[PDB]
Paper text:
Human cytosolic prolyl-[name] synthetase (HcProRS) catalyses the formation of the prolyl-tRNAPro, playing an important role in protein synthesis. Notably, glutamyl-prolyl-[name] synthetase ([name]) is a dual function enzyme that catalyses the formation of charged glutamyl-[name] and prolyl-[name] in the cytoplasm. Inhibition of HcProRS activity has been shown to have potential benefits in the treatment of fibrosis, autoimmune diseases and cancer.
Pro binding induced the movement of the side chain of Arg1152 out of the ATP binding site, providing additional space to accommodate the binding of pyrazinamide derivatives.
Author numbering:
A (entry chain A): 1016 to 1311, 1318 to 1464, 1473 to 1512
B (entry chain B): 1016 to 1311, 1315 to 1463, 1474 to 1512
The structure:
Amino acid sequence: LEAKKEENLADWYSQVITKSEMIEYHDISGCYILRPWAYAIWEAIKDFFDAEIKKLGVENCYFPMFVSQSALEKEKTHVADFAPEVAWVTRSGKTELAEPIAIRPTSETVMYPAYAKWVQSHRDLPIKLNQWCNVVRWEFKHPQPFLRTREFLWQEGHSAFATMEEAAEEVLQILDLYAQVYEELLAIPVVKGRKTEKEKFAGGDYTTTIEAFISASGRAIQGGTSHHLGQNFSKMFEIVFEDPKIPGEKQFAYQNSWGLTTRTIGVMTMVHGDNMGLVLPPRVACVQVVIIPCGIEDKEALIAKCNDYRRRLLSVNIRVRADLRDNYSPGWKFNHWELKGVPIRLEVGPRDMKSCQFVAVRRDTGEKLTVAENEAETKLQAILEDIQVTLFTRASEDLKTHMVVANTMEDFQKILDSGKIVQIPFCGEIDCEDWIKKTTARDSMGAKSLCIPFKPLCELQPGAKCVCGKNPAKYYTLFGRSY
Amino acid sequence: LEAKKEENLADWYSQVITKSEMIEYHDISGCYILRPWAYAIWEAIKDFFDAEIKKLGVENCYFPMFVSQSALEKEKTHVADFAPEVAWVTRSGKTELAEPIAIRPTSETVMYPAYAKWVQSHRDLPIKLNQWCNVVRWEFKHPQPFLRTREFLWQEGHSAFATMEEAAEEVLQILDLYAQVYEELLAIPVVKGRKTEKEKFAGGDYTTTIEAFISASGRAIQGGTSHHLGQNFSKMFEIVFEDPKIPGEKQFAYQNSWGLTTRTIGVMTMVHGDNMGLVLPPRVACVQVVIIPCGILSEEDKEALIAKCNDYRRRLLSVNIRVRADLRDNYSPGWKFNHWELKGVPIRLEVGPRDMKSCQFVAVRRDTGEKLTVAENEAETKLQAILEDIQVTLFTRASEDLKTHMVVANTMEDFQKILDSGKIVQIPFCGEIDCEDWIKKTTARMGAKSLCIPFKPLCELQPGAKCVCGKNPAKYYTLFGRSY
Ligand code: PRO
Ligand code: PRO
Ligand SMILES: [Sr+2]
Ligand SMILES: [Sr+2]
Ligand SMILES: [Sr+2]
Ligand SMILES: [Sr+2]
Ligand SMILES: [Sr+2]
Ligand SMILES: [Sr+2]
Ligand SMILES: [Zn+2]
Ligand SMILES: [Zn+2]
């Protein structure tokens, strides 16, 4: 690893993801290979989120990836803000197809015709379906592994309800699960808020989101989305149910949709990584503890003690690997598993082995702890938990010191250009948000809105005006440069 | 269910997969929706197979779905066979791309360029990667859900080895796992064999496969394949490693690939499905036991009735018997009886007021329909024994139908006659591609194709035996018959 994070973040990020064996590059621009080390992190996210939504009654399924040309021309609002982001398949080999079919940028147009057929009575509600699949979102920006990719893995849940009350409560419930994925699994603090009318999901009623901050570049990034679609989609696809008491009365269902992608892994890398490579939170680390024989007569004695620790950690269900390979130097193994971000390195040397003790090296801080043999299960469990909270507390210390309030325009400008995100009084108008992005690049890149936070840092002053100095302010809005 | 299995099988198949809430149709032909009832079966197959390949050192990953045209044409024999069924992306919205890119029909040409970068030394081998993903093969033949789809889910494992012995060993290991999936999980007997030169994976060395038989249609179907690719792909993508003992020497890696698709669910539906609907083998049954309260006057005693269903729901979970208590008060019990019958739940547990007073209940088997009156005492043990008896009964019934419609034929006179009986035949075959085309041509005057060259044939081919054509010597018994 040659590049430094605080200097050239782009070169550092490329070396960290590749030398840790997370990502390989593909011949198709914007497409990246998810190697096992990174795929296991997605599986840890998948295992947590799947078990949580099944408590809410959500069931897993799989819908086709192709969208017909007629189905996309259904909702006029959903097709406009998505057509340039859709790749079309027009031929099979040397034979043109009947009609050009589209690769899914999202599965609203695929599932909701089926929802209309499944929903006829009030007993058929609520429908709660989820799928883990890939999605092709063609775009024109600069692709980045995990962060901005033309193909990415995600889950997308789509729920239909008989009332808007229950639909509104699922939006926040799923958004809170997304917050737990970032805060409790990846040790990343997020800000929960609402998207502005300019950046909300097209055709939906409102979009909620979680925003994470990357202090290495001073830019924020959207971590997830939970949309309330209202009856907009159910009216165009005719998702209607019969009234359970009023004979013959039919009502359009209230729908939601929510997604979480593999950019979680990229935000984990950007926030926690250092100049020695990746840093994995123990909650999602494929290997939490790596056992390395040091000082490698009684050679079989040292190897069997490594196997004793390996099985003792498996009994308390700690993900452990014993690198017993004789082809590489111990110092080589030290650097190999540090680049890969293993939270704890367990070193067993001949002297320590005969003393019934070992050395545990913390990946986050580099601290070396000498631990006795009998305390291996309890101590290593305590260090792993201490690593998880340390990563979260240090990440939140960056968020608290890089998100502040500004009530005028150029103080919002002055704080922004120092690598921060700012909450400002905003009128919420779309034409005003265009001027903000143009002025932020005028007086780099132009700052766009991130979210209208639920719990802002400060409450709005009575009668406070927007930063544009032309319309009254509706709410504090978190602005800043974004990926 | 409208149609019946013995009559219009295609109509029966559509009814059973939709009324069981497995498949919903899409407005694009060949593409189908995997509803949660069908997806749970795929998840059960995934959990078994994934754990088995982890023991062999295989690791999960995910490669991109797009293929460049330069990488696709790196192996000429491989691209020549998949070319007509490759879906090509040619436009981004309303703008035509300068160079079109392809949707993967398979991931050999996607992964092996990455294998070349990862393999430099002998320590880099073996590589054993697997991915659970979707794939697109645009077959213009009349599609059918699960059996013949344009897009389907599968797993594909790709392994590279330093030697041929270990590579050849993995081929038979993965093949036996595919056999376990059909026989142990889905209760479907299969025949292990090698595909002919005409039907093997183009570009590979040899293809092993498992062939199942559908007695309702008399046709056989390929249930999965495990290919030995040899060095044909490593030579084209330059997957080379330095010799561990000879300085400067490099050798090409020996590669394998193996895939199992959602066709498994279709075969399970075709083999075990009856006129009452789907029939799930208890090994992959999302719900093995469904509790339905039946007998609805006294609201005070009905309160203890739902408590009895929850009582059975709780203690059945102690032995981890997947049990669901259908306690919905917005549907008739008779509606729930036929609803869970269509879905194929192996056992229906009916709770009645009189049965509660007599300290008894009634268990209904899905495969046989035998309504058996059991007691509260042996509720956990006998429902466990009935589940295992259902799995064996389904497998025995499908094995007897296979052992009945798979016979040996030493003459085209016998081969075409027993082919009209809705059967499959093992005949002495020379293995020539031109002869396999002649066999397919003369059996339509509905043409029969080659299925597999069985490892354990019905009879042994002794020297002096000629092929069914008569122009060349026969080298092995080959299972023929009409296929999907
Ligand atoms: O694309 C989106 O943002 C929503 C959420 C997942 C499904 N559609
Ligand atoms: O398509 C096939 O049949 C082989 C096996 C899985 C990957 N490629
Ligand atoms: Sr549900
Ligand atoms: Sr009305
Ligand atoms: Sr109404
Ligand atoms: Sr491995
Ligand atoms: Sr040589
Ligand atoms: Sr050589
Ligand atoms: Zn304004
Ligand atoms: Zn012949």
